[PDB]
């Protein structure tokens, strides 16, 4: 009967509950295959030769084209829209009314009243919502991530998007683009060369080495693909598959899964009564050991996850007011952190042991997460809750479990805390998760993006 | 230049030195999704409540029609066509003139003049070439196995192939059916309502339940496929992903990668001209730490892994005056290795070692094999090679590791022998090994199908 967030609230109980309890499923990355060669030599690819990262599946894409579109994303983002002009991207992030992050995704500015978003559905789904019902003079073509179990259906995208990352990647690129290519400033936006291609590129890079990000029609990606691959092959490049690729961002730092802000307050609830009943918000999942029976409680606002440097209060954009309210010095921090090698070992120990009545929640490698939203309590010697730990896995490079986390903002690089691993009770009923028993793992702040750190 | 395997060997040096450096990459059971909820509870579920195995995507199909049809599967298996009539079923062994199994799969008898073969594609390609070279009246349509990574292509097979296992199968079968069905004999065949279809049954069965497997035209795959999701949920019937389902073997017992024994000899010279250079058996790779330069030191006879009660002297069949040669009660026979959790959890607490040189070989869960066909040196106490483990992974139902392997007669139930896991001199160049170093596991001699063995 619910056909709206708000009918499933009021229909659902407690939303923590019914989050934390969903039966969802795993957030899948999609069609992509999972392992081109096996998922620790692609790791080991993207710190040491080349990769091809295929993003063609995973995320949605929104087409925003219209006189109104630049000023859908500056009435929306707490980015500074001052002097952006066609062939610059921005990370746009927008906040509620309450000053709490929704979601994030990239904008590229593609010409005059052309734009794209690519990114989860959370701020596709606030952009469509603002241009529908906020009178702006704009039009939308929303393109869906793919299927996340196709079962031999076709799959279909409007764009194929890939990176080329990794120290030999630039080699790669100006053996593909037939010369030498200038490295831009960061998310710049400009073209090269494939296969006889004009193939528009953003710059990007990780792992202090330059790469590309680049894009064009669904028709032309495997004449781009076969490109890449062959050109690589000189330098070592291969191919990254699915279940290898998203680990990538507990080295990178980017946190992707913040809980959409938008379960709560009356100004958002003419957003609950359009998401669907089927929406990223209302069939999406809740996992690990925080646990409060307030929504609001799992809400981060762009400080606290990294984003504080692109507030710029120049422009109106909704939720301005609370985040100047906000003091960005006593806000917590995102950190990383690097998880006790010797907890590791005891942790999947438990997995052969025929004797235990339980053993701990099973860590999938090397991405460990079994929810869209991912919320595990950090705490410190005294048994206090001083963070939250939002995507965890491992690192074939650092051979360490790594997870990227908020934590209060006076607590110094080197401290070791713990993560509380596993669910109480014997775990929710999600149906990605196993009865198991809860362990603290010993866990050390380190910087983000990661660098060893001394405990 | 190589169009077939005879000229890819005349080129290629030493053949196990090919195989076991192979390129092919892992063996992919492929297009369905990897997990619907989790690979254990998955697991569980077919020793506890009732699964749906969807094996539509990973075995080749050859539908054999004609007036040879029958002489064609007699004259190639071992097994007995005595009283052979429709609606029966056999598990098809083919072996060469030296007496060494080729492989192995399903042969259904559907009607006068009309077989299907299921299984992997070695006795496929026996099938097709005998039925091509050998004078045989009769007609092949060639099904192979989905693509391993499909990336978003559309996927088609003619019939779509499941199965319901598990304690509660047969009241899942029954509430479809809409009242009783009978119980034939193993591998006879019928039928049963499924949302008004009459669908063609095979009566099978793992754990000490029975079950089915069925199958029909693709065209209604999803219409069955969903009857069965839906009668099934009263009774916890879920379906299983293509994580969990290889790993159903290593508990059911059955050895699905003999090598292909037809590497050498002069009676096979023909069939090695005949197969193509992009053959399984050209193209696939051989992964463990059983060494030999001579590739027949892989092979395996029907009496070591299990089919020495399905010879039968009444019919003329390839490799007969080899198999009659041969004593039964001197063969290795095939038994499950229970590995020593300790020694689990030791290789596993190599990956989260930070100082470490090297690591114990990854042991993917639940499936850890990382070829085609699989040859670990089972060892015993002086350091003697007595066996060879051929199928490796780990049951969340027994929280063990295991393998199935073929060990010298005279081995008792209970012997602690050991396995050999991982590749020498840090392993070979298969994309699907990284850098390791080896290590003798300890393994406990248990019966097959597996039953626990106390040590």
Redesign the interface.
Same mark, same amino acid.
């Not at 650092?398 to 479990?401: H, L, N, P, S, W």
């Given at each position: 009967a619910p056909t709206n967030l708000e009918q499933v609230l009021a229909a659902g109980g407690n939303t923590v509950e019914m989050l934390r309890n969903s039966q969802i499923?795993?957030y899948?990355y999609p069609?992509?295959?999972?392992?081109? %060669?096996?998922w &620790?030599?692609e790791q080991?690819a993207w710190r040491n030769s080349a990769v091809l990262f295929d993003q063609?599946?995973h995320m949605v894409d929104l087409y925003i084209r219209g006189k109104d579109a630049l000023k859908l994303l500056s009435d929306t983002m707490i980015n500074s829209p001052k002097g952006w002009e066609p062939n610059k991207a921005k990370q746009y992030v927008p906040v509620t009314p309450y000053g709490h992050v929704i979601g994030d995704g990239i904008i590229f500015y593609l010409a005059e009243e052309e734009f794209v978003y690519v990114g989860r559905a959370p701020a596709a789904n606030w952009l469509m919502y603002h241009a529908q019902t906020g009178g702006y003079n704009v039009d939308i073509v929303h393109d869906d991530r %793919?299927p996340? &179990?196709?079962?031999?259906?076709?799959?279909?995208r409007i764009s194929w998007r890939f990176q080329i990352q990794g120290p030999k990647a630039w080699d790669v690129i100006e053996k593909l683009h037939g010369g030498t290519l200038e490295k831009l400033k960061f998310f710049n936006m400009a073209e090269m060369n494939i296969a006889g291609m004009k193939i528009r590129t953003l710059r990007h890079g990780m792992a202090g080495a330059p790469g590309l990000e680049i894009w064009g029609p669904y028709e032309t990606q495997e004449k781009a693909r076969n490109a890449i691959l062959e050109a690589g092959k000189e330098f070592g490049l291969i191919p990254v598959g699915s279940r290898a690729y998203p680990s990538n961002t507990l080295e990178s730092g980017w946190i992707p899964s913040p809980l959409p802000a938008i379960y709560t307050g009356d100004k958002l609830k003419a957003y609950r009564e359009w998401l669907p009943a089927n929406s990223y918000e209302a069939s999406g999942a809740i996992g690990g050991s925080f646990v409060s029976s307030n929504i609001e409680d799992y809400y981060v606002n762009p400080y606290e996850i990294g984003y504080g440097p692109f507030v710029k209060f120049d422009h109106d954009f909704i939720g301005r007011d609370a985040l100047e309210a906000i003091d960005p010095a006593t806000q917590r921090k995102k950190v990383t952190l690097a998880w006790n090698?010797?907890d590791?070992?005891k942790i999947?120990?438990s997995?052969?042991?025929?004797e235990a009545d339980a053993?701990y929640k099973?860590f999938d490698?090397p991405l460990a997460n079994?929810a869209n939203t991912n919320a595990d309590a950090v705490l410190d010697a005294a048994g206090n809750v001083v963070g939250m730990s939002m995507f965890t896995g491992?690192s074939?490079n650092?051979?360490?479990?790594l997870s990227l986390a908020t934590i209060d903002h006076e607590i110094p690089v080197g401290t070791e805390l713990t993560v509380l691993w596993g669910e109480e009770n014997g775990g929710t009923r999600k149906?990605?998760?196993?009865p198991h028993k809860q362990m603290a793992v010993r866990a050390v702040v380190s910087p983000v993006p990661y660098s060893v750190t001394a405990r």
């Open positions: 499923g795993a899948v069609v992509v295959a999972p392992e081109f %060669s096996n &620790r030599t080991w063609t599946h %793919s996340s &179990r196709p079962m031999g259906k076709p799959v279909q090698g010797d590791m070992a999947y120990a997995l052969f042991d025929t053993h099973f490698l079994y491992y074939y650092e051979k360490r479990a149906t990605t998760v196993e």
